[PDB]
Amino acid sequence: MNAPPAFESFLLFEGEKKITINKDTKVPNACLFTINKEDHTLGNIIKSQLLKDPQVLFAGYKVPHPLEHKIIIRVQTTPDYSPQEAFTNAITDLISELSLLEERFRVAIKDKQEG
Amino acid sequence: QKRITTPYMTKYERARVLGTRALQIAMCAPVMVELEGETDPLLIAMKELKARKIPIIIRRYLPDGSYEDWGVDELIISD
Amino acid sequence: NRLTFASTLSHLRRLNSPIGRDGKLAKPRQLHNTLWGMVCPAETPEGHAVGLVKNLALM
Amino acid sequence: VCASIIPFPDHNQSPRNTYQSAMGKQAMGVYITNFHVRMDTLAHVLYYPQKPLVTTRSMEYLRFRELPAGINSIVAIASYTGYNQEDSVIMNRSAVDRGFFRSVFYRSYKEQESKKGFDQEEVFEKPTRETCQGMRHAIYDKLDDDGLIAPGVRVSGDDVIIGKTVTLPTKRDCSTFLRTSETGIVDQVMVTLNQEGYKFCKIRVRSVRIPQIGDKFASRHGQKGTCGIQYRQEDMPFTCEGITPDIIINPHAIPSRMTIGHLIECLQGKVSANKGEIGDATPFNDAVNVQKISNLLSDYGYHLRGNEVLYNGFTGRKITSQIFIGPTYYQRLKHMVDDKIHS
Amino acid sequence: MIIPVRCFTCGKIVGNKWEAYLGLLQAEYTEGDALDALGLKRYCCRRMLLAHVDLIEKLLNYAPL
Amino acid sequence: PYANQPTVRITELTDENVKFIIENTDLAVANSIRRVFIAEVPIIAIDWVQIDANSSVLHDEFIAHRLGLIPLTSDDIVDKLQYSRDCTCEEFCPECSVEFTLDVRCNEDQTRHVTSRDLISNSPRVIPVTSDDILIVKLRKGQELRLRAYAKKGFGKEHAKWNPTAGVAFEYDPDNALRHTVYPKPEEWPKSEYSELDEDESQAPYDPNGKPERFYYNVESCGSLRPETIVLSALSGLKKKLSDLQTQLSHEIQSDV
Amino acid sequence: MIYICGECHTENEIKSRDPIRCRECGYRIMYKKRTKRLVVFDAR
Amino acid sequence: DFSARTVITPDPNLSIDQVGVPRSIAANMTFAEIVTPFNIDRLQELVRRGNSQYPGAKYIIRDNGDRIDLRFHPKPSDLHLQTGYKVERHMCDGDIVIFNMSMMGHRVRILPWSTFRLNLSGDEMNLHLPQSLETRAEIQELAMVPRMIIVQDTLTAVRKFTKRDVFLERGEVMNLLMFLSTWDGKVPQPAILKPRPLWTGKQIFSLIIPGHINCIRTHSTHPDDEDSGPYKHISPGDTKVVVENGELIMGILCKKSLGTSAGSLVHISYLEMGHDITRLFYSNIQTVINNWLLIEGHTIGIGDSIADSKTYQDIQNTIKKAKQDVIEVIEKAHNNELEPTPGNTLRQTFENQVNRILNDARDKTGSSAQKSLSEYNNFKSMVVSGAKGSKINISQVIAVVGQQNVEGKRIPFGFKHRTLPHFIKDDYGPESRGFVENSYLAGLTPTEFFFHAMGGREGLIDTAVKTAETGYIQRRLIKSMESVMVKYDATVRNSINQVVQLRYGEDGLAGESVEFQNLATLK
Ligand SMILES: [Zn+2]
Ligand SMILES: [Zn+2]
Ligand SMILES: [Zn+2]
């Protein structure tokens, strides 16, 4: 009755934007990425990569409520750089990072099978 | 005049004045202060108290039967 | 009480303290030494009627 | 009977032993074997009533081993996400999806058509909108030609399950609807004749209750703890071997409103499961000791005190404090949120 | 009532192991020895077999409708 | 300002589980991938069950539910199949679901139990893992259990039955080089299998500078998806979700500009 | 409707306003076999 | 509009003022609202939703007072509303609710599950919704939780968080600061810049402290001689709490420093800043500490109860010495050597001497147990912070349970001069009279278990009657002072207008704003 559907955790609600970028006026060069229908599996993926970038001054994520299933990411960078670029560039590195891992795994998986 | 009650406004008076004003605002009552998009009626009345524009006049009944007419603007509110 | 088998067994062996003058004058709620091996000391409903209702010892 | 099933009651505080006596009765489980044939107003039967890993010798005589009223759980005592206070507990959502604590609920509805008055009498039939003048808005397609809903029909919300009308001096509907709004399926239908000889019938409505955040779970000793929050297997703190605890309880309960027997039972449960032997829960057996149990656990590549390194599900970094995890027996209490809200 | 399909903790299948577990017990094997043969290294799965009760045996005694 | 190269090697490969070590990887990526196996990995399991005749001792709800927990050997069929929501169907089709059936009847005096072998599936490849054997229920003489079931692709987070991982043993820094976990008495604690340390050394010396690396993975499968293929799908499944975020992210920037 | 005796477990058709008794036994308790309207079950 | 009672569950994410409510309960509950042009569209859409959809209206009231049910929706024109109407729209987010004569208001938040969520900082409850706007405004202005005023799961972690040992890496700091609502947006400079940045727990907590509030407190484990020593300002154990300009420069926080008391950070902030700022202080502490707790972690196990063999010998030696001493006292009374005190009789004097020997042993052995626990030990952490438990509880778990007194005395002779059949007749020894020399961990003897039950039974009976009697006093006191109030002439008068007090509290000051202090012109 009151139990929420199990698929709402990942399913995208109709007429709801998956990603919303909101600028923060507390400190210059700061933005909030309120992703929806995601969990900590995605929040930690980008936060760690953002820290690796020297041009990132402050990057982090948090969940307002586990049942909400929406994650908020706050990114702040240098005046020359932009939080939007940091979020975009970091994702590309992850895709490249996983591509090497996926490709290298396929290289080594056959090696063990044959011996 | 000759009013002996405290110049400050009690918390109970503040709550009732805002509540009554907020109810009035929700009933198509006019707003003295400028409207900058505040939809919620309580916010409209809250800034009215800050600007000292609420027409409500507080009549404090003394225990002896006498009453003192204290204006909301005259009373010193705490912000 | 058929909610659980253990509850059913306890109810059958359930005991009740005396009521009226006899129970009132005494202290049935308080645990006495004579209950050793005859009435379970730990088992007693919680609430106002604490110690009035007890359970027979296993043996 | 209720105190005998408690391991190490001497290690436990006296009020806790008394508290368990009340909780033990409220625990839900297989009360008897011939539950299907009988009809009871209230009857909770557990999906998987499993005998405990730690059992007392006197438990055999009570036959509680044959018909237990709880399911074991690998309980890690930690403060995870701060969702469990002194009276609370955190469950594993994935475990419940596999049947961790699910149980059935049976409510028996009973009615008879008796000729109390010569002019007016009760009958069993479909209350058609035309022949019946007074009626309540509800779906009547469930009822059959005999006025009794056949077994195997899903019933939800306000629905008529038995048709009864009174031929007042045109008939007035007086059927019986569901007591609550719970969704259930009728299990079996019984038609009989009462002692007076009038037709009398009983029907048992079966509903499935899935444990949720509002259900109250209680250990074998201590205060009952409501399921503060349910977390998926990924979010639960997994150990080195990949064993996400089924239940997480608040460590702050152990000091006062809980007993060291919970820790000892966890240690015994870990040894019992690892060594494949049911532990002895005799209250006054000098053979069983905390030090002896710790030594046995160390032989199976485990910490002598049962502490384990749990990796936080959200962040993979090791938790600074080593959590204490063990297979502690747990029982589900009759108090459930669904019953209260559905009312 | 009946052995669960899989371990509630991790998800390893344990229902199929129940049939072999009982068969090993009557084969003079120790309670813990049988678990090792079935391949239950984790203590969570060993719990599902070591201390399980098959209540359906007594229920099947009653005749059906 | 870019990511590293996650070198990966495999220790031992077997049917039940596969062990591999990933080096030069961030802790978040390794930890996230661990939960990607449990939830993100899609597998085919029974979700829709309808009973035509049930005379067994167990109840309709219990029997119908138990089928879902039974894993199905969906190695490559899961990839080609699609979720019911995104399909153009109002009723299950072979392209967005599969057909399952189980028609048994007990007439012998001896107790007969229906197991997963009697669970017939239209798709030859999509079959129960055992097909000893996953027993469903025990049937008495004169008891029959005829029902029809369907299975559909679903995420692990949606339900536990859609989780192919039978316990993931993820470990890192077994010797506690970075002191991420502090033991009051390190001597008592046992030595982990992956640790390379002497008997007389309780733990490795603390290094002032260092990062988590050389993550040890042991993915144990329930038989539905082979442990050597779950990793391939998980890595592709995680990144394809990451790319989807970028596509929506670009739209937001297009709106701001 | 068709009912089942609780002793012999045999089909016996009982109409409305008819005594409830098994011809083969005289047993006074009858049950209902099942409904032909099937329901939908979800493994949750 | 009384609602259906439902169980209570905790929710740290929710603010203390906020309350979680399920969709089903809120659907039944309705809040009459007067439609206005500024929100005419808002009511127009909600009424269109209908009762099937949760965000709907159960009834709509016209100016004439007629109520039209929205379940049927007979005509679209009837659905349309005019200005000045009253619409019983279903409860939504942001509404004010009041529940447990002083009641605290809350802001309702809709959550998926059924059970209510409360940010405690269990028992079923029913939440009441104020229909009228006037009382709704009044409730949110004076009856809110911030104006009415920490869990034990946080205080224990707060003490560990503020320890000097705790050091936070850049990655960890980012997560903690994200949950900080009252954050300026600038990351504080690390305490240890090189070789790597490392923020101390206090630095993160410094931002948690609102504004600039200064207070000095002491940790529970603060040696008395430390203050008199030269290291008073530089505490060797960090047992002194000092805050300057809102920054926790030093000291480990605990219930004494952070918990409610005459002088505490929460109390000082309430007077210095107010209630609204104080609530954020509670929320920030709960949220930030909970996230950090996932890294540090709090647990409990057998290792905490298992003490070193050295202390076990001392505990048994003290127990043995006490047992021998009791026998010596018994022998003296047996031979008539014992002399009764002038203020007591021989029988009562003997009971007093034996009680002190047993009572002293428990305290001495219990005190040694407290020193036995190491810093890493979880038992010490709870008591040191003072969150949950007590030093006596640890004593009964490790050292000794202690004497089991019944009705203020030792176990009475239920049988003829013997407490139990096993003990010899006229036995006044430790075991016979209920002295429990075995700790909970070790295990009690069969005789001790029954004696322990007798002591516990008395407590349960006293607790059962204590609540009944205490509750009666509360109701009685309220009735006799329900009409007592402070009038506009700064006088306390009842309904009859009789002067109870010329000035409230004899000074004319509120009891909440007053702060404890010691003027130094008399000592
Ligand atoms: Zn397992
Ligand atoms: Zn399709
Ligand atoms: Zn018959």
Task: Concatenate the DSSP letters of all residues of D120-183 into one string.
Answer: --EE-S---TTTEEE--S-B-TTS-TTSBPPTT-EE-SSBEEE--EE----EEE--EE-SSS--
Q: Report which of D77, D133, D81 is spatially closest to residue D262, judged by C-alpha positions.
A: D77
Query: Of chain H residues 163-222, which have a CB less than 8 A from chain D?
Result: 175
- Distance between CA atoms of residues H77 and H423, nearest Å: 91
Burial of F132 (0-12, 13-18, 19+ CB in 10 A): middle
Q: Report which of F7, F2, F8, F17 is spatially closest to residue F218, judged by C-alpha positions.
A: F17
Q: Report which of H92, H104, H74 is spatially closest to residue H25, judged by C-alpha positions.
A: H92
- Distance between CA atoms of residues H55 and H68, nearest Å: 17
Q: Report which of H251, H222, H82 is spatially closest to residue H159, judged by C-alpha positions.
A: H251
In H335-445, alpha helices (H): 346-372, 378-385, 391-398
The torsion angle over the Cα atoms of residues H309, H314, H315 and H317, rounded to 10 degrees, is 120
Residue holding tokens 């017990």? E25
Chain D residues with beta carbon closer than 8 angstroms to that of F176: 318
Contact between A109 and A46 (Cβ < 8 Å): no
Tokens representing H21 are 């409510």
Q: Report which of D3, D63, H174, H384 is spatially closest to residue E55, judged by C-alpha positions.
A: D63
Q: Could you list the residue range(s) of the whole structural domain that residue B4 is in? A: 1-79
Q: Report which of F193, D268, F37, D308 is spatially closest to residue E11, judged by C-alpha positions.
A: F37
Across the interface, of H113, H174, H184, the residue whose CB is closest to A60 is: H174
Helix (H) or strand (E) holding H492: strand H492-493
- Distance between CA atoms of residues A93 and F3, nearest Å: 5
Across the interface, of D33, D37, D98, the residue whose CB is closest to E6 is: D98
Ligand nearest to the CA of E48: 1
Residue of H13, H174, H187 to mutate for A, most A C-beta atoms under 10 A: H174
Burial of H149 (0-12, 13-18, 19+ CB in 10 A): middle
Residue D83: alpha-carbon gap to chain centroid = 22
Taking CA–CA distances from G34, the nearest residue in chain D reads D151
The amino acid at residue A11 is L
Instruction: Give yes or no for D304 touching F (CB within 8 A).
Output: yes
CB contact under 8 Å between D327 and E53, yes or no, is no
DSSP letters, A37-80, are: S--HHHHHHHHHHHHHSTTEEEEEEE-S-GGG-EEEEEEEE-SS
- Distance between CA atoms of residues F120 and F103, nearest Å: 8
Across the interface, of E1, E47, E65, the residue whose CB is closest to D273 is: E47
Instruction: Give yes or no for E40 touching F (CB within 8 A).
Output: no
The residue among F106, F134, F160 that closes a domain is F160
CB contact under 8 Å between F143 and E6, yes or no, is no
Contact between F230 and F221 (Cβ < 8 Å): yes
Residue holding tokens 């990411």? A73
- Distance between CA atoms of residues H241 and D199, nearest Å: 80
Contact between C32 and C55 (Cβ < 8 Å): no
Q: Any idea what the Cα angle at residue H200 is, between residues H196 and H201, rounded to 5°?
A: 145
Contacts of B39 (CB under 8 A, 6+ apart): H38, H39
Q: Any idea what the Cα angle at residue A28 is, between residues A27 and A33, rounded to 5°?
A: 80
Q: Report which of F224, F128, F165 is spatially closest to residue F40, judged by C-alpha positions.
A: F165
CATH number of H152-296: 1.10.274.100
Q: Report which of H308, H315, H288, H304 is spatially closest to residue H381, judged by C-alpha positions.
A: H304
- Distance between CA atoms of residues H140 and F180, nearest Å: 46
Contact between H106 and H97 (Cβ < 8 Å): yes
Mark whether F167 and F217 lie in a shared domain: yes
Tokens representing H54 are 């949760």
SS (H, E, C) F13-61: ECCCEEEEEEECCCHHHHHHHHHHHHHHCCEEEEEEEEEEEECCCCCHH
The amino acid at residue H28 is N
DSSP letters, A8-19, are: GGTSPPTT--S-
CA–CA distances in Å: residue H501 to residues G3, H491, H506: 82, 6, 7
> D touches A (3+ CB pairs < 8 Å)?
yes
CB contact under 8 Å between A1 and D235, yes or no, is no
Chain F residues with beta carbon closer than 8 angstroms to that of E59: 57
- Distance between CA atoms of residues D318 and D322, nearest Å: 9
B/e letters for D243-257, b = 16+ CB within 10 Å, e = fewer, are bbbbbbbbbbbbbbb
Chain H residues with beta carbon closer than 8 angstroms to that of B18: 137, 141
Burial of H141 (0-12, 13-18, 19+ CB in 10 A): buried
Contacts of H515 (CB under 8 A, 6+ apart): H262, H263, H267, H271
CA–CA distances in Å: residue F45 to residues A110, F36, F70, G43: 29, 18, 7, 10
Q: Which residues pair with H493 in a beta bridge?
A: H485, H499
Tokens representing H44 are 């127009």
Contact between D192 and G30 (Cβ < 8 Å): yes
Mark whether F94 and F140 lie in a shared domain: yes
Across the interface, of F5, F28, F157, the residue whose CB is closest to A100 is: F5
CB contact under 8 Å between F6 and A89, yes or no, is no
Contacts of D124 (CB under 8 A, 6+ apart): D113, D146, D147, D148, D162, D163, D164, D199, D201, G16
Q: Compute the residue count for chain F.
A: 257
Tokens representing H280 are 């954020």
Taking CA–CA distances from H304, the nearest residue in chain F reads F184
Question: Coil, strand or helix: which one is C36?
Answer: coil
Centre of ligand 1 from the C-alpha of residue E12, in Å: 5
Chain C residues with beta carbon closer than 8 angstroms to that of D284: none
Q: How many CB pairs under 8 A join E and F?
A: 70
The residue among F160, F188, F223 that closes a domain is F160
Centre of ligand 2 from the C-alpha of residue F47, in Å: 15
**Which residues have beta carbons under 5 A from ligand 2 (an ion)?**
F 87, 89, 93, 95-96
Question: Coil, strand or helix: which one is F185?
Answer: coil
Tokens representing D34 are 């011939």
Residue list for the binding site of E for Zn(2+): 7, 10, 44-45
H448: left (phi over 0), alpha (psi -120 to 50) or beta: alpha
Strands D154-155 and C53-55 come out as unpaired
Burial of H197 (0-12, 13-18, 19+ CB in 10 A): middle
Burial of F117 (0-12, 13-18, 19+ CB in 10 A): middle
Instruction: Give yes or no for D21 touching C (CB within 8 A).
Output: yes
Q: Report which of D300, H132, F220 is spatially closest to residue E7, judged by C-alpha positions.
A: F220
- Distance between CA atoms of residues H424 and H429, nearest Å: 10
Q: Which residues pair with D231 in a beta bridge?
A: D92
Helix (H) or strand (E) holding H48: helix H40-49
Contact between H443 and H451 (Cβ < 8 Å): no
Contact between H438 and H403 (Cβ < 8 Å): no
Q: Which residues pair with F103 in a beta bridge?
A: F146
Tokens representing H79 are 């659905």
Whether F93 has a binding-site annotation, put simply, is: yes
Rg of chain F over Cα atoms, rounded to whole angstroms, equals 24
The amino acid at residue F98 is V
Instruction: Say whether the peptide bond before residue H195 is cis (omega within 30 degrees of 0).
Output: yes
Across the interface, of E5, E44, E58, the residue whose CB is closest to D33 is: E58
The torsion angle over the Cα atoms of residues D252, D257, D263 and D265, rounded to 10 degrees, is -150
Taking CA–CA distances from H179, the nearest residue in chain A reads A62
Strands H96-99 and H104-111 come out as antiparallel
Q: Compute the residue count for chain D.
A: 343
Q: Compute the residue count for chain G.
A: 44
Tokens representing D58 are 């006197």
Please report, for chain A, the start and end positions of each structural domain, with discontinuous segments joined by +: 1-115
CB contact under 8 Å between D212 and A3, yes or no, is yes
Q: Could you list the residue range(s) of the whole structural domain that residue F86 is in? A: 43-160
Tokens representing F241 are 């979700």
- Distance between CA atoms of residues H256 and H387, nearest Å: 10
Centre of ligand 2 from the C-alpha of residue G41, in Å: 19
Q: Give the minimum alpha-carbon distance from F132 to chain E in angstroms, rounded to a whole number.
A: 6
- Distance between CA atoms of residues H227 and H239, nearest Å: 10
Q: Report which of H183, H42, H23, H179 is spatially closest to residue H113, judged by C-alpha positions.
A: H23
Contact between D251 and H298 (Cβ < 8 Å): yes
Residue list for the binding site of E: 7, 10, 44-45
- Distance between CA atoms of residues G31 and H497, nearest Å: 75
Q: How many CB atoms lie within 10 A of CB A58?
A: 22
CB contact under 8 Å between D14 and H457, yes or no, is yes
Contacts of H203 (CB under 8 A, 6+ apart): H188, H190, H191
The residue among F134, F160, F186 that closes a domain is F160
Strands F43-54 and A21-23 come out as unpaired
Contact between D297 and D303 (Cβ < 8 Å): yes
Mark whether F143 and F236 lie in a shared domain: no
Question: Coil, strand or helix: which one is F8?
Answer: strand
Active site residue ranges of D: 87
Residue list for the binding site of G for Zn(2+): 5, 8, 22, 24-25, 27
- Distance between CA atoms of residues D334 and D80, nearest Å: 26
Instruction: Give yes or no for H138 touching B (CB within 8 A).
Output: yes
Q: Report which of D22, D25, D43, D23 is spatially closest to residue D33, judged by C-alpha positions.
A: D43
